[PDB]
Write an enzyme that holds these catalytic residues in place. Structure first.
Site, PDB file in Angstrom:
ATOM      1  N   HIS A  60       0.807  -1.213   0.000  1.00 40.34           N
ATOM      2  CA  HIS A  60       0.000   0.000   0.000  1.00 40.34           C
ATOM      3  C   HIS A  60       0.832   1.251   0.000  1.00 40.34           C
ATOM      4  O   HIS A  60       2.001   1.241   0.389  1.00 40.34           O
ATOM      5  CB  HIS A  60      -0.995   0.031   1.179  1.00 40.34           C
ATOM      6  CG  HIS A  60      -0.447   0.627   2.440  1.00 40.34           C
ATOM      7  ND1 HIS A  60      -0.407   1.987   2.675  1.00 40.34           N
ATOM      8  CD2 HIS A  60       0.040   0.042   3.561  1.00 40.34           C
ATOM      9  CE1 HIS A  60       0.114   2.212   3.868  1.00 40.34           C
ATOM     10  NE2 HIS A  60       0.391   1.047   4.427  1.00 40.34           N
ATOM     11  N   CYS A  61       0.213   2.337  -0.440  1.00 44.34           N
ATOM     12  CA  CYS A  61       0.808   3.666  -0.352  1.00 44.34           C
ATOM     13  C   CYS A  61      -0.275   4.648   0.144  1.00 44.34           C
ATOM     14  O   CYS A  61      -1.145   4.238   0.915  1.00 44.34           O
ATOM     15  CB  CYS A  61       1.510   4.048  -1.669  1.00 44.34           C
ATOM     16  SG  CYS A  61       0.539   4.102  -3.139  1.00 44.34           S
TER      17      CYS A  61
END
EC number: 2.8.1.1
Length: 103
Positions: A60-61
């Protein structure tokens, strides 16, 4: 493949790694407690360390962009795992009502 925050939770409960590819300053400001930090630039240089490898890896970011745009890089970095991208990133996680840790 994208995964919803709630579906990611279920995989994490079965041992899947959640890897935050943002920078340390971003992580320290606000992160997902279950996540392991590994900035994308570091992963591109030295690869995914053994301690972050698993049968299932979720990247994820912030909001879904860096994972979507670096999909081929991430697919290689975590190979040969089953790899997912957290839909809408930590922003999506927050919108789903799942906990974050704020400085």
């Amino acid at each position: 493949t994208t995964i919803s925050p709630h579906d990611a939770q279920e995989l994490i409960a079965r041992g899947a790694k959640l890897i935050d590819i943002r920078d340390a300053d971003e992580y320290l400001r606000e992160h997902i407690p279950e996540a392991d930090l590994a900035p994308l630039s570091v992963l591109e240089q030295s690869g995914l360390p053994a301690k972050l490898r698993h049968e299932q890896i979720i990247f994820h970011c912030q909001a879904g962009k860096r994972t979507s745009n670096n999909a081929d890089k991430l697919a290689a970095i975590a190979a040969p795992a089953e790899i997912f991208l957290l839909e809408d990133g930590i922003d999506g996680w927050k919108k789903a009502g799942l906990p974050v840790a704020v400085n």
